[PDB]
Design a binder for this molecule. Sequence first.
Ligand code: ZN
Lengths: 267, 32, 49, 48
Amino acid sequence: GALNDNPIPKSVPLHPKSGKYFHNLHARDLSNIYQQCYKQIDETINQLVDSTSPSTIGIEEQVADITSTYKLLSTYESESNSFDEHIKDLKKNFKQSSDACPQIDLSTWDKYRTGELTAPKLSELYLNMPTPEPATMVNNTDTLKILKVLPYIWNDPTCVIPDLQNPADEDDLQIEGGKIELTCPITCKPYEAPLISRKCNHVFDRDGIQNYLQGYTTRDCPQAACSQVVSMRDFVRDPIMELRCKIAKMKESQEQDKRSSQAIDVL
Amino acid sequence: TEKIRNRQEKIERYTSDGTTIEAQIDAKVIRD
Amino acid sequence: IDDQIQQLLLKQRHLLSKMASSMKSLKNCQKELISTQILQFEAQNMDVS
Amino acid sequence: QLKEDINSRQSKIQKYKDDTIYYEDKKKVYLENIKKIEVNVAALKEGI
Ligand SMILES: [Zn+2]
């Protein structure tokens, strides 16, 4: 073996001065950037519902592309998360192994440079550090729920998708065939700020669900044939119902504007 | 011994300071 | 209005793809920067030793 | 401000805990050494 006449050792244990430097070694927290992205995508969803003409089809490709984009972005966030986790574990292991390795003096300088003493090398260990993998892909936002279901919702807005409440399971959500009512079962009114129940997936207008539960702490689900005892906290904003009602109302508004104009042309 | 005493003192001081500033920032959290 | 809107949504998906690519660059270059940073740390460790 | 506070707190607490461990180990080593030299003093006094 060609010993190091270059007294720089191949590997050295953690020197305390750089132990401090090593403390500063970390992957940057990009989760703020990802939250900004997720907020932008949610606003994109809302404005996509707001603008898209319900009489015009062809948003399925838009939603699918943004679906793939957001899955890719969540994958990147997860890669960074697993990268940070691997950095933490790698730092812990490197510190333990280096501290298990003799500290550096002239004698250990010669031993480490000649290979007599070997210590973990953060460059080498970082190469040996597990590659950033998707760790907890951020799919649990309402973003991927809409980006997944919105082609089909565009094909038919009133369709019931019963597995929109669990974005935590990253398996593809199997949409069951159904139609969610466009009228509040309580007030018999179209949804304005609809609240969905996490227990039975029945969605009611916020005013309607508040009125049904008014005067009592918890009451049964207002939808017919449902006995789920629910309260205001049990109901959370339903982006899906807002999307459905919004699309339906916009289609009706286009129809009504054309009908009202001809309705005046009659007089 | 003096060194470790100083380190522990500063650790406690700056831990308290970090918690306080974290609470302050949580307060600091927060057209048509 | 409808078709202009559909164009806007096409812009949505396109710029989202741009964001995804730039986020790939984001995460990968963050990993790269901390890689050379830990390499610098190793060199400095050897230096102070 | 949260980023700066977290970074400063982590850095300072790391520096001081590392110094705590380092100088505590040094204190233990010096106590062992003083025990050895006390044994040497006792042996020399016995020779006296
Ligand atoms: Zn329910």
